[PDB]
Structure formats: C-alpha cells, structure tokens
Amino acid sequence: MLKIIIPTTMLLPMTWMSKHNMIWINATVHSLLISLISLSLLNQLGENSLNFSLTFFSDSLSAPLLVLTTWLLPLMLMASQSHLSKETTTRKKLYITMLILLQLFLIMTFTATELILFYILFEATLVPTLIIITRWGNQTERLNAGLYFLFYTLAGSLPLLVALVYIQNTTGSLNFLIIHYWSHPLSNSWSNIFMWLACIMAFMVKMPLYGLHLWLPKAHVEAPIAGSMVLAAVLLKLGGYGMMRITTILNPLTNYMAYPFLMLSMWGMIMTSSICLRQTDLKSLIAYSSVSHMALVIVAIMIQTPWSFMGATALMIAHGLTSSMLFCLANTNYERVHSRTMILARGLQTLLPLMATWWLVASLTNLALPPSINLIGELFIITASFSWSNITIILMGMNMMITALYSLYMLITTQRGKYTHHINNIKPSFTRENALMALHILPLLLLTLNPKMILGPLY
Template sequence: MLKILLPTIMLLPMTLLSPLKFIWTNATAHSLLIATLSLQWLTPTYYPHKNLTQWTGIDQISSPLLVLSCWLLPLMIMASQNHLYHEPPTRKRTFILSLITIQPFIILAFSSTELTLFYISFEATLIPTLILITRWGNQPERLSAGIYLLFYTLISSLPLLVAILYLYTQIGTLHLMMLNLTHPTLTNSWSNLLLSLALLTAFMVKAPLYGLHLWLPKAHVEAPIAGSMLLAALLLKLGGYGIMRFTTLTHPLSTNLYYPFLTLALWGALMTSSICLRQTDLKSLIAYSSVSHMGLVIAASMIQTHWSFSGAMILMISHGLTSSMLFCLANTNYERTHSRILLLTRGLQPLLPLMATWWLLANLTNMALPPTTNLMAELTIMIALFNWSMLTIILTGTATLLTASYTLFMLLMTQRGTLPNHITTIQNSNTREHLLMTLHILPLLLLILKPELISGIP
C-alpha cells in the first residue's frame, strides 16, 4: 500500500520544485509510473484481504477501483495541458497540486478497513474537487455549482457519521474485519431501519440516485476537464463502492428499503436517458448519461447477490473509463469551437477525421456494444435484476434502447451534418490528445480478454 501512497504524496514536492518547462512532463511521467506500479493490485486472489495493514486492506471489491484511480491521474494531467497553457506559473502549480492531493484521499477511501478513516477520506475528496470547480471552471455559474456540490454532499453525509457512531456504540468496534466476524444482524425495528437508511443516503447522493442527482449536471458542466473526469470516473464510484461495502454489514436489508431505492434507480435510468435525447449541451448530455448508468449500479448493488455485485463492479470500471473519454472528446471540441452547444459544433468529421474515429469508439462503448466490458456488465446486471423480479426487464430494456438512441444522437450531431458557417479554421488534433484517447480505450478493450480482474469474483 505504502509503495503507491508514498510516491503519490512525493508528487507534491516534485510539482513545487520542478522547473516550469518540465512541470507537465515530470508530473505526467511520474504519475504514469505510479499507475503502472498499481497494476499489481489487479491479480485475482482467493484471500479476502491483500496488502493488509492496520488500517487499509485490498480485496476484490476495492482493487479494480484503486487501479482506476491511479490510472486516471496522469490522464487528467494530460487532458488539462491546453486548458492551462496561458495561465501564470503559480496557477499551473496549484492546479496540479490540487489534482494530486485528491489521489491519496481516494486511495484511502477505497482501501480503508476502518469506518472512521473511510468517512474522513470520503469527505476530504470534496475539498480539492470544490477548489477545481470554483477556481478553474469556465462560466460564472461555477460558484453556484460548487455550492450545490458542497451542500448536497455534506448534508447527505451527516447521517452517515451518526450511523457510524451508532454502530460503534452498538458493537464497540468499527474495523471491517471485526464487523464481518460479529455480523451486526439488524432486526426490522425502527432504529435499525433508520440506521440502514442513514448508511445508504450519503452514497445514494454521491452515486447519484435519480431525485438526488441535481448537483451532478451543474458540477459537470461548470468544472474544467480534469474536474469532469474526476467526478465521472472516480467520485461517483465512491457512492457505488460505499453501497457495496456497507449493505453487506446490514445484511439482509429491510424490504422497506429495497423497493423505493430500486424503483427510483431504474426509473431514473429511464428518465435521464429520455432527458439526454432533448439535451442541447454536450457536457450536460454526458453528465445525465452518467446518472443513467449509475442507476443500474445502484439497482444491482441493492440486490446483494454475487452476480449483481459482479455486474455493478464491471459497470463502474467500464463507465469510469467511457465517460472520462467522452468528457475528453467534448473538451477537445470545446477547445476548438469554444462552444458546448450541439447545434454550433456539428459536422466536425471532415475537419478532424481521426477524432471522429475516437468519437465512434467512445460512443460504441457507451452503447455497450460487444466486445466491450460494458456489454458484459449490463447483461450481468439485467440477468440479476430479472431473477429478482421479471418486471424489471421492461424498465432496463427501455433504458438500454434509449441509451443507444441518445448515444447515436450525440455521435451524429457532433460528427455529421453540414458544418456551421462560423467555423472557418480549426486547429488540428495533436499527439497528446490521441495518446489520451488511446490510454482510455485500450484498458476497455483489453479487459474483456480477462474480465475476472475487475469482476470481483476470484
């Protein structure tokens, strides 16, 4: 654990002390080395906890997410270079520092075996994210987006703190290993129902569940590219991970809690897919599609079977890479046309033919076309939901149909059609962008060859 955490923390002094002309090269190269080193965590084992220290341990639920969070740091740094090109040196350093600061917190959140440490790192990721959105966002509305993000997350996670303290008074320990041994069997009394609800609320807002998702499109639209990638690929996954980790503590969940959350998640997948069909803003469209995909993750992790957990895990990893890639593509368009409105940035295929290939690949993975892990994830989740209740096939089937519709709509609007008159010259796509897209799509295509690495099943 420390051989990843310490180099990550040492990135901070390196960023401060690097000469300005080497700052991007150094930060990217070193974070890529850390990402490569973290791939060792993916080896599937039969042991419940690998790399176990007193406070952190890695098991099949956390290892894929940990590798994803290490993998995305160099990609976020690469994506932000053009965005920060004209900024003064101190702002560049501060930006990279705030990106690097999030990483140890996320690693601790995904690997902590102690609930207090989990809660602290879960909340600490909020501060650098808020700094990124409010300091480096594009529009003046970024302040209200930051306030939305802060208050939604804070208000929802206070019940989680109360629930953790209540668990401590009941059992006398908050260590996950001890909790698994003592198995706090919760009866259907009101206090236990409220405890389960409080445990779930914070993660449902973070995930986000439809109805509690209003902070997400605002935050995504106003955030700089690194902020969008971070939110879509990692911070939403904290919600899904929390549900998977904590619902097993309160096993089995009361049916009074199952039904509203499951219904809202599946209905939300349907509704947000419909909203995507009417979107005019490209980043907003991708943000709403995230809510739709995470709805499936929530629904799957509420059922608490091996199949559904496995499907939720694979979907979280696939969606993390896919949506991050889509945001990068939207950003390349925005940097050239300075507009996110679909009508004003259409028909770019003749001008940027290689970018059109990346658009096609990203959209096909978003639609869950074979042979991508997205397809495997959606099929696994659908089968788990269908076994639980046959009626869910109506909602999930319609949501999948709508996902295909809005993804094709996004592809056709950005790439095909007549070029708007105001676009006369456009900057060529460069090697950095192609490398960025390759590093997103390559894991997606390679993971299907050995999906047990991320399926959570040894």
C-alpha cells in the first residue's frame, strides 16, 4: 500500500518546489498518475483480502473508495484553477497542500487495518476540510458553517473513542481481522445498548442521518468548489464505510436497535426530497439530494443483507460521482452569474448548448436512469428492503418519483425558458469546464459495463 501512499506524500515537496506558474500542471499530472497507479487495487479476489502488512490492508469495499478518492483530486484541482487565479503563490501552494493532506488522510483511512488508527485518521480528515471551508470561502457564514461541520462530527465521535478503547480492554485487540474472526454476540442489556449507540452515532452524524443533517447544507453551500466536491463525494462515505466495518460486533442487538434509525431515514428521504422541490438555491438542492441518497444508504446498511451491502456500495460510488459533477456544474454557472440563485439565470441552453447537454446527463444520472450504477444500487436496496418488509416499497416508490421531479425541475428552471435579458456576461464555456464534465461523467458509463467492481465483498 506504500506504493500509493509515498507518491501522495511526495506530491507536497513537488508542489512547494515548483515554479509560480507551473504548480497546477505538475499537481494535475502527478495526481492522474497516482490515480492510474491506484487503479491496480481494483483487482480484488473472492478470498479474504489483500493484507499488505500489519498496518494496511485492502478489501473490495476499500478499493473502489480508494480509487474514487485518488481520482477526485485532479478534478478538484481543475475546478479550483479558476477562482484561485488572483491568489498569491504561497496561498495557492497552501491550498494544494491542504488538498494533498486530505487525500493522504483519506487513503490511510480507507485501508486502516486497526480501528484506532482508522479513528485517528477519520478525525485527521476534519482539519484540512475545516481550514479549506473557513479560509477560502466567499460568504460571511462560512465560519459558522465550519463550526457546525466541526462540532456535530466531534459530538458524534467522542463517545466512539471511549467505546473503542473499551473494546480493546475486553476483546484485547482492535484489528479488523481478529475482530471478525473472534466476533461474539452482544447480550440484550442497557450497557450493550449504550455501547451500540456510542458505536453507531459516530458514523450516523457524518453520513448524515435525518435530524443530524443541519450541518451539511451549511458546509456545502459555504465551502469553495473543491470543498463541496470532497464533502459530497468522499467525506460522506466515511460514515457508511465505518458502519459496514463496525456492524460485525453489534449483532444481534441491531435487529431491534435499528428501528429508530430505519424510521428516521425512511421518512427523512421523503422530507428532503420534498424540500428539494422548493429551494431558492442550487447548492442547497444538491446538498439535500445528497442527504436523501445517504439516508437510503443508511437504510441499506441497517437492513444488513448481502444485497443491501452491494446496493449500498454501488450507491455510494455513483452518488459521489454524480454529486461531484452537479456541484461542478453549479459552480460553473455561479462563476458567471455570481449570485447562486436558480431563477436569476434562465434559458441557458440557447447560450451554452454543451453545458445544457452536461446538465441533462447529470440530471439523468441523478434521476437514477437504467442501466446506470445509480439505479443498480437503488434497485438492490429496494429489493432488500422489500424482503425486510413489503410495505417499505411504498415510501421508496414515493421517493423515486419525488427525486425525478426535483431533478427535472433543476434542469427546467435553469436551462429551459427565456434567458435573462440583463445578463450579458455569459461567456462561452472553456475547455477546462467541458473536460471536467467529461472526466466526471465518462467513468460512470464505463463502470456500468462492469458493475462487480463496485458491488463490494459480498458479490
């Protein structure tokens, strides 16, 4: 695993020693090379795992997330190239350093053979993201947003640490292999109930769960484009990865401890999908759509069936890609309008046809159009929930309909209609933006050819 960690570390001295007008080229090229190297991890095996050493190991749940994390950085660099043009060389190097540190922390988090190291890196990811949100944020609310994005997370995970060490005082180890092989049931007791709560609430808050999601619209709206990319695409999947890793010791208590969370997620998907219908902001709409998709993933994880896990993994990957592309499109519109309001900019297919095509494809992918991996995860989770209970489909069905609605609404209000007359600063889309859109959308349609690469270890 060091063959990928070491180049990510070496990205920092290369950036800090580069010329004042050549940092972006070097960063993008070497990030793409690192992603190409990390593509090797996709060759998983039906056997146990790729146990590299005592500290790092790779599974078919960790491999797609690692590949997505490595692939995200070049896209974030291309997205941030624009609004950091008038920025001093030292501050641009600091921004690239923060991005590289975040990628390194995520890469070390996704392997994380030991659970305490996983938690330490899980919380280490919080610092560069907070710095990015609070420093390079345009609006005045960013600071408050950052505060939220911090405290919620910590409020979730401070008990977890205690629980973690408590386990090592009883079980004696926190290595995931030993934990899996020496698993023992949790008796129905109040102490076990609170241990379950401490283990679960840590990852519930960052997913986020409905009722604990108030930090997410603030963090995504107030953050710069790269921050929105990293939060929507990868940083949301940390909770799901942690839950799928840690639910191996919570049985059979979960069989009755998942009812409040299942109810909360199955109603919050509807609530957030309806919230998306009436939104005056594009970024808030995308954030609430992300909340709905993550609530569906939470339902899948709480069901705890093989089809649930497969659908959860596929949906996480597809949602990360789709949300990243949607945030990029919204930022491209904002950089010309400088308002971030849906109804101010209208009739854009007359002026930017290729951007309208990109918007259509992104909306269709969000709308879960077959045979995309989005719908693969959707159908897997839906069938698993139907097996769990034949009534859930009703709620699920409603969500699907509502989803499509707001998606096309986002497509119709911004692209269709008559253009705004008093906006004459709509320049033709650059090659950079179109290349970013293509690099976002082509991997989705290529992954739909080989779904088993993102279906997880239970395929």
